[PDB]
Amino acid sequence: VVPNFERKGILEKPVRPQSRLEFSYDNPLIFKNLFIYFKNLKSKNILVRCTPTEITFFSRDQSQASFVIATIDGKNVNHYYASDVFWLGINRELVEKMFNSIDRSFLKITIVHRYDKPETLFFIFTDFDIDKECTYQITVSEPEEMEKSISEERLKNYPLRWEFTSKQLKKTFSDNYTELVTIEGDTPLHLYFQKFNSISYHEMYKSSNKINLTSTIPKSQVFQINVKIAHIKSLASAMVTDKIRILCEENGNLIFQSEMDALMLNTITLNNTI
Amino acid sequence: VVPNFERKGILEKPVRPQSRLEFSYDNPLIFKNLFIYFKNLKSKNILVRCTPTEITFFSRDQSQASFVIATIDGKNVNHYYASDVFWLGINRELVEKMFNSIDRSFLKITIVHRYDKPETLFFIFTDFDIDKECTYQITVSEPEEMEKSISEERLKNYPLRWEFTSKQLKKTFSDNYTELVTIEGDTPLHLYFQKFNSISYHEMYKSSNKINLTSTIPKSQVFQINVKIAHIKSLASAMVTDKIRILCEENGNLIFQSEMDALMLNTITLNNTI
Amino acid sequence: VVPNFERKGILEKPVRPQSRLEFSYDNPLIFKNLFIYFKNLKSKNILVRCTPTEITFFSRDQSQASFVIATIDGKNVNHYYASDVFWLGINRELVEKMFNSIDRSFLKITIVHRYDKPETLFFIFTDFDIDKECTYQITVSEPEEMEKSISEERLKNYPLRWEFTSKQLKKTFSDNYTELVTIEGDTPLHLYFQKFNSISYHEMYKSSNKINLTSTIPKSQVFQINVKIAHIKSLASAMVTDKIRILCEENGNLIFQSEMDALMLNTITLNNTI
Amino acid sequence: VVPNFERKGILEKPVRPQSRLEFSYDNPLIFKNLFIYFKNLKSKNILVRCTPTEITFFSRDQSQASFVIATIDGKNVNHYYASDVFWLGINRELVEKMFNSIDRSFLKITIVHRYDKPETLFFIFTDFDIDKECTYQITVSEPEEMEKSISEERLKNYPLRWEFTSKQLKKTFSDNYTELVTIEGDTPLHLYFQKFNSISYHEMYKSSNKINLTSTIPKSQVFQINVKIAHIKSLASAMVTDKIRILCEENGNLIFQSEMDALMLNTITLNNTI
């Protein structure tokens, strides 16, 4: 029993007049996978920002080296209404079982937040074989760094970007130091680090199009950064997607970008960590 | 070698003039599965009532929260005679191996009780590939609560009933408290309890026909019961059938009903247990 | 590379004039299986009698309840010569590895005993893919009860015999006492013993032809024997064949008979064991 | 993406004017398997001799009973240049992971040694699906018995040679002593030793052509050698190829010869070891 689900996008009014937030989507596995990623990074509390145009989940990883911004725009889901801008806090372990219980048989997820129950976030999963709606009442808080969202504004245009598959990235970083990323016109991308037993190891990408690399680096100006390999390896081990887009800045800042469906998964790792 | 077995039903006389009870049936696995159920409930002694029209096996589970009545009517088996009404006691561990030794190759089970051997119950299994009859002499006692059979008389007409599969019931009750069953005309069946980590969880059945639900509850009168979830979960873990029919009473009484073939398996869980 | 092997039988002269015994056969697995049987019975020394017409291997099992006579007649093998009647002793553990090394690729086994090497028994296995002959020099002794061979002479004609498969015999004896074998004209074969937890158990074979049973018991004279079930169960666990013929005597004596190919495997269990 | 690789052989000049050695080959698995063999023999340091015509890897096994000479001639690879005769030392554990990381997806291996980096040996592996070159900088030494290469000159013409598969050799030597190899015209090859429990065991090869045996032994002169079976068994357990050619000398010297592709793998075991 697979119904066809209309995609309505942002609505001007909610279906229930008491809803501060109404969300529904026909791919609930994005939420299961989002929360596997949070578990792998050992994020303890997930902060949520709801807005008339999108819902955003935020957390540092446990090491605090990296920050995750997961955004779902309302125009890309089946049903989205949010009255205004508000914030919620969700303890990750509390919702872990629920999100893990989703499988490929769940055809829908609905999330409701009502003015008259400000400490509750309702998650609704419908099974359409027998028409049973299953609801979880997840207690949430309001917590009122800050803006790393600037790093991923439409305009912050990074000079060096490419794409790895989960396989490629985990092969590269297979064997307590840094890895140098260096480029250049003709752009051989160079990656160098020390592998097992202090052996100097070098990868050279001769074809920018096979790894979908783009560069805005001026012809003869060199780009070289030194980033810590332990942070990269942990982000690789934690991936839930098949592909990441890596974006690099001259001061060493790194943005990892994965897309699931309506979900845009951004992981920022700035070079300011001691 | 599969013979065709005539179904004769209740006979007016036995084949052996000394038989107080003669039973035979062409689906011996019902007895294997009946006795797996008794083992799962850890019933220690199985009491038997034989009657000119049916044979009934009785026992409490080990917790005493539930009572099992398993009935096989003589009109539905291959061969049935009983001289009068009498009672026997069978120690479950004593017959456990025998009943577990049945498999899909057994085409017949015969049970004989003779006046001149009042402490013996004969079980006969025939293998028709080589025409060997194998007989067990099971020592039995006569023990002379009482009538919970009233709860399942033809007339005790419960206002709320539905059907779950083994899968559905075990999914519902997957994660030390009670579960509220509530209904209402339009009947959304509501089930609510606390799941992992004190999360309020709610199942709502919008289609009465997909779970084969029937209700005799008057239009606007509410039906709500509170029953202990530990007793339900143990009955679910113990099921040997694929489907149960759940019947509910306004005072919280519950009757679970499974059918194997000629065997009707009833499990009663009244709301009087402290 | 499978050659065709001529079956010559008993020859009047050996190929090598110094051979006291020359044997060869195109089914060496009979020897592997014979020696698995000896290992299962934990026979320590295997005695061998060689004769112008046949070779015989003899041993008690470790319990001494049973005696094994394994005979290979020279007329049924590819090549057989024996000068006269002589005896050899073979330590079983010494040859166990060799006999276990045979597999379905061995197409031939040759055994040679020469006058000038009276403490040596030569075993020769040929691999015809590359034409390599592999030879083992097995040191043997000469040891010069006695005649249980009388029990299995052509004339000792037992009143009750039948056949079980390995499966049937192991099912019958599946669960420290005796088993009664009883018969009778119309011959229902009856077997009775105590199964698990002192339950009296009875098997009745209504069709003599499905178990290939023959009886020479006079019409109305009863035949009943009591034999120890532990000895039977050990012979069943030790079988290397798919079928045994059971032969019974009125004093309780039992002969088990299996055939491999040219090998006749007899196991005698007389009722004189305390 | 499988390109076609030109085989150019020895070049008169290198592609990079600073190369003392340039090697490349389109079967990098020969190097993986060469280094599995060295690991199995527990060779600690691998010595390398580079020459305008070939590259040679040398090491004793850990027991020092055997010496390995692995030669790759430049005329048989895709690209080979060497300026002169020079020697390098490679610690085996240091390169073990790298060589083990090769799989059937590697289509190329390049090895470069440059005058201006005399302590470095560069290994380059190219992945042609995405055009990434991966390079390892392996630190090497220069170490400046000696000539066992004489044993395998074109002219040292051994009187007895044959071929075993890995399977055959490991079956022969399946079960602290010596094994005698003896021959003779008509050449039955005889092999004799003591197998399990002091049993004299003899293999006789009646067909010289099925094991590809050649002999230059004069008609009636006997050839017999006694070699230690422990050294043979260890070389068998260590094989990485499917076939070895065994060459024998009258003083007991043994040469084992395997070919991978361009790699000739020679293992010498002279009879001078105490």
Q: How far is A34 from chain D (nearest CA, A)?
A: 30
Gap between the Cα atoms of A125 and A103, Å rounded: 11
Q: What is the 3-state secondary structure (H, E, C) of chain C?
A: CCCCCCCCCECCCCCCCCEEEEEEECCCHHHHHHHHHHHHHCCCEEEEEECCCEEEEEEECCCCCCEEEEEEEHHHCCEEEECCCEEEEEEHHHHHHHHHHCCCCCCCEEEEEECCCCCEEEEEEEECCCCEEEEEEEECECCCCCCCHHHHCCCCCCCEEEEEEHHHHHHHCCCCCEEEEECCCCCCEEEEEEEHHHEEEEEEECCCCCCCCEECCCCCCCCEEEEEHHHHHHHHHHCCCCEEEEEECCCCCEEEEEECCCEEEEEEECCCCC
Q: Are B274 and B231 in contact (CB under 8 A)?
A: no
C136–D206 C-beta distance less than 8 A: no
Gap between the Cα atoms of B128 and B106, Å rounded: 8
Gap between the Cα atoms of B95 and A93, Å rounded: 48
Q: Enter the tokens of residue C92.
A: 């079983």
Q: Enter the tokens of residue D97.
A: 């992971």
C197–B94 C-beta distance less than 8 A: yes
Q: Are A223 and A250 in contact (CB under 8 A)?
A: yes
Mutate to test the interface with D, among C132, C133, C134 (most CBs of D within 10 A): C132
Gap between the Cα atoms of C136 and C122, Å rounded: 6
N-to-C CA span, chain B: 54
Q: How far is A198 from chain D (nearest CA, A)?
A: 9
- What's the longest Cα–Cα distance across chain D? 65
Strand residue runs (E) in A118-235: 120-127, 132-139, 160-165, 178-182, 189-195, 199-205, 214-215, 224-228
Which residue is closest to B196 within chain A, CA to CA?
A97
Mutate to test the interface with D, among A170, A181, A186, A199 (most CBs of D within 10 A): A199
Q: Which residues contact C268 (CB under 8 A, 6 or more apart)?
A: C66, C67, C68, C69, C148, C151, C152, C253, C254, C255, C256
D131–A202 C-beta distance less than 8 A: no
D206–C132 C-beta distance less than 8 A: yes
Mutate to test the interface with D, among A175, A190, A210 (most CBs of D within 10 A): A210
A204–D132 C-beta distance less than 8 A: yes
Mutate to test the interface with D, among A195, A198, A211, A243 (most CBs of D within 10 A): A195
User: Considering only CA atoms, which of D111, A130, C35, C225 is closest in space to residue B163?
Assistant: A130
> Do the chains B and D touch each other, judged by at least 3 C-beta pairs below 8 angstroms?
no
With an 8 Å Cβ cutoff, the interface of chain B facing chain C consists of 93-94, 97-98, 129-139
A196–D134 C-beta distance less than 8 A: no
N-to-C CA span, chain C: 54
Q: Which residues contact C146 (CB under 8 A, 6 or more apart)?
A: none
User: Considering only CA atoms, which of D25, D135, D14, D23 is closest in space to residue D88?
Assistant: D23
Which residue is closest to C188 within chain B, CA to CA?
B132
User: Considering only CA atoms, which of C228, C232, C231, C221 is closest in space to residue C183?
Assistant: C221
With an 8 Å Cβ cutoff, the interface of chain A facing chain B consists of 93-94, 97-98, 129-139
Burial class (CB within 10 angstroms; exposed 0-12, middle 13-18, buried 19+) of C247: buried
Measured in residues, chain D has a length of 274
Secondary structure element (H or E) that encloses residue B59, with its range: strand B54-60
Choose among B196, B202, B207: nearest Cβ to A97: B196
Alpha-helical (H) ranges within chain D are 29-41, 92-101, 166-172, 229-238
Give the phi and the psi of residue D246 in degrees, each rounded to 5.
-105, 130
B135–C199 C-beta distance less than 8 A: no
Q: Are A112 and B183 in contact (CB under 8 A)?
A: no
Q: Which residues contact C193 (CB under 8 A, 6 or more apart)?
A: C177, C178, C179, C180, C201, C229
What strands, in cross-sheet order, belong to the sheet with B243-248?
Answer: B86-91, B45-50, B54-60, B67-73, B263-269, B254-259, B243-248, B160-165, B214-215
With an 8 Å Cβ cutoff, the interface of chain B facing chain A consists of 168, 175, 195-197, 199-207, 210-211
Burial class (CB within 10 angstroms; exposed 0-12, middle 13-18, buried 19+) of D155: exposed
Gap between the Cα atoms of A100 and A240, Å rounded: 13
D197–C135 C-beta distance less than 8 A: no
Q: How far is D131 from chain C (nearest CA, A)?
A: 49
Q: Which chains have 3 or more CB–CB distances shorter than 8 Å to chain C?
A: B, D
Gap between the Cα atoms of C159 and C114, Å rounded: 44
B138–C201 C-beta distance less than 8 A: no
Which technique? X-ray
Count interface pairs C-D at CB distance under 8 A: 43
Burial code (b: 16+ CB inside 10 Å, e: under 16) for C119-154 equals: ebbbbbbbbbeebbbbbbbbebeeeeeeebbebbee
With an 8 Å Cβ cutoff, the interface of chain A facing chain D consists of 168, 175, 195-197, 199-207, 210-211
The dihedral of CA C206, C207, C213, C215: what is its sign?
positive
Enter the DSSP assignment of D105. Answer: T
Name beta bridge partners: D126: D133
Gap between the Cα atoms of D78 and D7, Å rounded: 4
User: Considering only CA atoms, which of A240, A229, A242 is closest in space to residue A269?
Assistant: A229
B196–A130 C-beta distance less than 8 A: no
**C-alpha distances in angstroms, B15 versus A269, B109, B204, B211?**
88, 16, 55, 45
Gap between the Cα atoms of B123 and B106, Å rounded: 13
Q: How far is A262 from chain B (nearest CA, A)?
A: 27
Which residue is closest to A93 within chain B, CA to CA?
B197
Mutate to test the interface with C, among B106, B112, B117, B134 (most CBs of C within 10 A): B134
C98–D205 C-beta distance less than 8 A: no
Q: Are B121 and B83 in contact (CB under 8 A)?
A: no
Gap between the Cα atoms of B179 and B190, Å rounded: 10
Gap between the Cα atoms of B98 and C174, Å rounded: 12
Q: Tokens 């209904």 — which residue?
A: B183
Gap between the Cα atoms of D106 and D109, Å rounded: 8
Alpha-helical (H) ranges within chain A are 29-41, 92-101, 166-172, 229-238
Domains, chain D, in order of start with CATH, read 19-139 (3.10.150.10), 155-250 (3.10.150.10)
**C-alpha distances in angstroms, A257 versus A224, A244, B60, C108, D268?**
21, 5, 61, 70, 58
Q: Which residues contact D155 (CB under 8 A, 6 or more apart)?
A: none
Secondary structure element (H or E) that encloses residue D46, with its range: strand D45-50
Gap between the Cα atoms of A26 and B102, Å rounded: 48
Chain D contact set for C93 (CB, 8 A): 197
Secondary structure element (H or E) that encloses residue B38, with its range: helix B29-41
Q: Are A208 and A215 in contact (CB under 8 A)?
A: yes
Gap between the Cα atoms of A127 and B172, Å rounded: 12
Gap between the Cα atoms of A244 and A37, Å rounded: 14
User: Considering only CA atoms, which of C180, C220, C186, C170 is closest in space to residue C203?
Assistant: C180
Q: Are D230 and D173 in contact (CB under 8 A)?
A: no
C132–D203 C-beta distance less than 8 A: yes
Gap between the Cα atoms of B190 and A100, Å rounded: 24
Choose among D196, D200, D204: nearest Cβ to C132: D204
Secondary structure element (H or E) that encloses residue B101, with its range: helix B92-101
Report the residue numbers after which chain A has a gap, meaning the C atom sits over 2.5 angstroms from the next written residue's N, or none: 144, 175, 184
Q: Enter the tokens of residue C6.
A: 């001529």
Q: How far is C92 from chain D (nearest CA, A)?
A: 12
Q: Are C119 and C137 in contact (CB under 8 A)?
A: no
Measured in residues, chain A has a length of 274
Give the phi and the psi of residue B138 in degrees, each rounded to 5.
-95, 120
Which residue is closest to C191 within chain B, CA to CA?
B134
CA atoms within 13 A on the CB side of A129: 4
Burial code (b: 16+ CB inside 10 Å, e: under 16) for C178-207 equals: bbebbbbeebebebbbbbeeebebbbbbee
Q: Are A159 and A250 in contact (CB under 8 A)?
A: yes
Burial class (CB within 10 angstroms; exposed 0-12, middle 13-18, buried 19+) of D216: exposed
Enter the DSSP assignment of D178. Answer: E
B203–A138 C-beta distance less than 8 A: no
Q: How far is C176 from chain D (nearest CA, A)?
A: 39
Q: How far is D239 from chain C (nearest CA, A)?
A: 22
Query: What angle, 0 to 180 degrees and rounded to 10, lies between the N-to-C axes of helices D29-41 and D229-238?
Result: 150
User: Considering only CA atoms, which of C94, C128, C91, C85 is closest in space to residue C109?
Assistant: C128
Q: Which chains have 3 or more CB–CB distances shorter than 8 Å to chain D?
A: A, C
Gap between the Cα atoms of D53 and D84, Å rounded: 9
Q: What is the 3-state secondary structure (H, E, C) of C31-79?
A: HHHHHHHHHHHCCCEEEEEECCCEEEEEEECCCCCCEEEEEEEHHHCCE
Gap between the Cα atoms of A173 and B44, Å rounded: 61
Query: What angle, 0 to 180 degrees and rounded to 10, lies between the N-to-C axes of helices B29-41 and B229-238?
Result: 150
Q: Are B139 and C194 in contact (CB under 8 A)?
A: no
Q: Tokens 């006749």 — which residue?
A: C264
Which residue is closest to C133 within chain D, CA to CA?
D204
Q: Are B205 and B246 in contact (CB under 8 A)?
A: no
User: Considering only CA atoms, which of A58, A47, A55 is closest in space to residue A90?
Assistant: A47
Enter the DSSP assignment of D118. Answer: T
Chain A contact set for D99 (CB, 8 A): none
Mutate to test the interface with A, among D95, D108, D137 (most CBs of A within 10 A): D137
